[PDB]
């Protein structure tokens, strides 16, 4: 009969209970305390402009219809009980296809204290939209948001608050990072209001500030481009009588820059503006293309004005390395600060 | 308190298998729509993703209640208890409502019987694209919805005053397209089992040229200019003027296949293909120009000098003339 007392308590709280009505209907406003524990901040997808995040989503409110007296002050009940009472209809405003996990059982918990207070947490995998301005790619920093609120209840019926100070209400796990090419500098927690055709809704907001790591794109694109430009300037040191040899130097480097130029945009979504990487390839292509034109000028003036051809070749051995070095200083100083 | 009493009375004897006024007059339903975002537009599959808040309003005299309470604001619990219109999207490929953390549905009932039913939907609709002017094409992607089982004698649909609403137009995931405007119409479609009222929303789109200039047009233009270098190289350098010529033709073939990956496998020539094919003629004709030049070197050395001089003027002028005709035709003539 030890568990019969608790059985009778539960059957009395649900005796005449109506889960279609929010707590304090027509009497007050239902206040919900919310906090998030990020178990793993998942990968960020540039193609879809979205990110993934796995969280413990905890909510709490007061429902005086669930006040009880008994040996225990808390009833840590099965999550099956949660579907027989009223729970908030929280949804993510910028939320894409999300998942509520169900293995091996519905990942939910419900706890009722003797004063009617409820705790209701669930494990979710939220995929949310993150608008991105790729004008500084691959040196761009983004602030990806996470907004949520009630769907059917306006701000005169249900309001949301953070359980603790807003900074400490969203907590990221120490070892949860699943980011491959981003750094999570920090998160910002706020709370606003959204006006719709159906009323005013309180919406809780949280922004994660992510900065892209450039190490992948240095090896993938920058180093191949820098070595292609240097390779095309070895042609200046070949004697002017190696016309077949210096033509292969020019043509192969031009086609190699074409290969890298197309390949560099595979990662990005098909945007319609020039990124920071595009301007580097365009200038690298200009240096490679101008080197080939420099040979055609030298070849044209040979055998008729040999002295002029030698002067052009000698100066090109200095101007081309110097201007490419100057360009790299201006390019990297510009984009690293911003 | 007595709200439980009111709800018990409303659903006492209520039959959700019957539409309101099942033998009197059609159920007039007013529809709204707030577009959250028009997602990616897929040319290969000829579809587009859209996320909306879809709202429906109608009267149901079985739900009248008298009290000081005007509007009962319930949640998705009661949706399955009362009659709901069976609206579906005719051209949809795959659509689903959102279910985190609960069903994203709203139900509000007024005292006179008016019912507001709102839900959040993500729809991948079907939009057939004509790609004859690609990448300078314009499309009007529709979104048609009707009632699956109720003909025009039972359910009638009607847009409200300002039905389709957008927020931040550019915040949408349209990368290659720019949203121009929207039209909403209303017609009746006669099927094999009755006449149905179909509501349509048309989104006008214009493709953005910026990506393809970086991707295809500029690389193809630079390859053509690359082959013009061959004309300033001495004719005696036979291996030099052939490698500069054979590579450009092979490279132009490589760019032709890459530029066609974005499109579906259609069987007509687009505007992109017309530019690539012409650029192929220029690089191919340059190599044939040298072959004619090389064959005439020994027989008529004086003549061969003139043939190379003309190519320094004919080829640069011919390509600059083709761009003038091509770009004017596809930007000011259709």
């Amino acid at each position, epitope marked *: 009969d030890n568990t019969t007392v608790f059985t009778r308590i539960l059957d009395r709280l649900l005796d005449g209970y109506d889960n279609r009505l929010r707590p304090g209907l027509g009497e007050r406003v239902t206040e919900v305390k919310t906090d998030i524990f990020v178990t793993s901040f998942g990968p960020v997808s540039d193609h879809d402009m979205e990110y993934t995040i796995d969280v413990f989503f905890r909510q709490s409110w007061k429902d005086e219809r669930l006040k009880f007296k008994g040996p225990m002050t808390v009833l840590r009940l099965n999550n099956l009980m949660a579907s027989k009472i009223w729970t908030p209809d929280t949804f993510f405003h910028n939320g894409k296809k999300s998942v509520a996990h169900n293995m091996t059982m519905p990942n939910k918990l419900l706890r009722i204290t003797e004063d009617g207070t409820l705790l209701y947490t669930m494990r979710l995998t939220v995929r949310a939209e993150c608008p991105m301005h790729l004008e500084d790619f691959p040196m761009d920093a983004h*602030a990806c948001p996470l*907004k949520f609120g009630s769907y059917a209840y306006t701000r005169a019926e249900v309001v949301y608050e953070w359980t603790r100070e807003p900074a400490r209400s969203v907590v990221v796990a120490e070892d949860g990072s699943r980011l491959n090419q981003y750094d999570l500098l920090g998160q910002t927690v706020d709370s606003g209001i959204v006006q719709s055709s159906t009323g005013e809704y309180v919406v809780m907001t949280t922004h994660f500030h992510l900065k892209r790591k450039i190490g992948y794109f240095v090896i993938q694109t920058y180093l191949p481009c820098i070595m292609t430009v240097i390779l095309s300037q070895v042609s200046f040191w070949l004697n002017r009588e190696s016309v077949p040899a210096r033509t292969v130097f020019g043509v192969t480097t031009v086609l190699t820059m074409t290969t890298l130029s197309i390949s560099a945009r595979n990662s990005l979504p098909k945007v319609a503006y020039a990124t920071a990487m595009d301007w580097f390839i365009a200038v690298c292509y200009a240096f490679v293309f101008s080197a080939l034109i420099e040979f055609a000028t030298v070849n044209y003036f040979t055998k008729s004005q040999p002295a002029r051809a030698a002067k052009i070749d000698r100066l090109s051995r200095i101007a081309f390395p110097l201007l490419f070095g100057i360009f790299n200083l201006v390019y990297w100083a510009t984009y690293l600060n911003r | 308190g007595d709200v439980t009493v009111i709800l018990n009375n409303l659903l006492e004897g209520y039959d959700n298998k019957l539409r309101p006024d099942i033998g009197v007059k059609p159920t007039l339903i007013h529809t709204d729509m707030y577009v959250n975002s028009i997602g990616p537009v897929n040319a290969i599959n000829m579809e587009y993703t859209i996320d909306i808040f879809f709202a429906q309003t109608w009267y149901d005299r079985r739900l009248k209640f008298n009290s000081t309470i005007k509007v009962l604001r319930l949640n998705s619990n009661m949706v399955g208890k009362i009659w709901i219109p069976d609206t579906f999207f005719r051209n949809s490929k795959k659509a689903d409502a959102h279910w985190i953390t609960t069903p994203n549905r709203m139900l509000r009932i007024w005292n006179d019987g008016r019912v507001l039913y709102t839900l959040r939907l993500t729809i991948d609709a079907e939009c057939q694209l004509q790609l004859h002017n690609f990448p300078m094409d314009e499309h009007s992607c529709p979104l048609e919805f009707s009632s699956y089982g109720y003909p025009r004698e039972e359910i009638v649909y009607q847009w409200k005053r300002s039905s389709v609403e957008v927020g*931040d*137009t*550019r*915040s949408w995931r349209l990368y290659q397209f720019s949203f121009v405007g929207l039209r909403n119409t209303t017609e009746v479609v006669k099927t094999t089992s009755g006449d149905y009222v179909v509501m349509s929303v048309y989104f006008d789109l214009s493709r953005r040229m910026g990506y393809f200039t970086i991707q295809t047009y500029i690389p193809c233009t630079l390859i053509v200019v690359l082959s013009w270098v061959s004309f300033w190289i001495n004719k005696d350098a036979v291996p030099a003027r052939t490698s500069l010529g054979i590579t450009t033709v092979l490279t132009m073939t490589t760019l032709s296949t890459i530029a066609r990956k974005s499109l579906p496998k259609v069987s007509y020539v687009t505007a992109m293909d017309l530019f690539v094919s012409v650029c192929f003629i220029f690089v191919f004709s340059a190599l044939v120009e040298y072959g004619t030049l090389h064959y005439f070197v020994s027989s008529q050395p004086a003549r061969a000098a003139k043939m190379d001089s003309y190519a320094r003027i004919f080829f640069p002028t011919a390509f600059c003339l083709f761009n003038l005709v091509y770009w004017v035709s596809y930007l000011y003539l259709g």
Partner: nanobody
Framework: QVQLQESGGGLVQAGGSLRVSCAAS????????MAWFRQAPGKEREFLAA???????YYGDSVRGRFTISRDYAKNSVDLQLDGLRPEDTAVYYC?????????????????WGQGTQVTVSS
């Protein structure tokens, strides 16, 4: 060249509706967050309100329920309705835009600023 031109504002007496409007030109700042800032003479620059691309409205605690912000995404402009004005509201009102990196309530997160609009309240 981006120009966050600010119109409206001016001298007011005993409070009242003083709607200040800011128009963005040269670039479509629809994806960006457009905010409003107030700088009293010599005190500091104070955040007032901001609306993002999702029509989410944020307000400072000192002006919550008094000032209302709205955005007209079609015309690329953001307004701010000033009601119940007080002598403490006499300052130069600024219009900003940015991506809100490291917080939308911080002035340093906005890359574009307007020339400012003077609002004088007499009481």
């Amino acid at each position: 060249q981006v120009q966050l031109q600010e119109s409206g504002g001016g001298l007011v007496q005993a409070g009242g509706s003083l709607r200040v409007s800011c128009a963005a030109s040269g670039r479509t700042f629809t994806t960006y967050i457009m905010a409003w800032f107030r700088q009293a003479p010599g005190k500091e620059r104070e955040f007032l309100a901001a609306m993002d691309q999702g029509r989410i409205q944020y307000y400072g605690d000192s002006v919550r329920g008094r000032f209302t912000i709205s955005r007209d995404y079609a015309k690329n402009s953001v307004d701010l309705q000033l009601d119940g004005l007080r002598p403490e509201d006499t300052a130069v009102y600024y219009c900003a835009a940015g991506a809100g990196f490291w917080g939308l309530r911080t002035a340093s997160s906005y890359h574009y600023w307007g020339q400012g609009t003077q609002v004088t309240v007499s009481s």
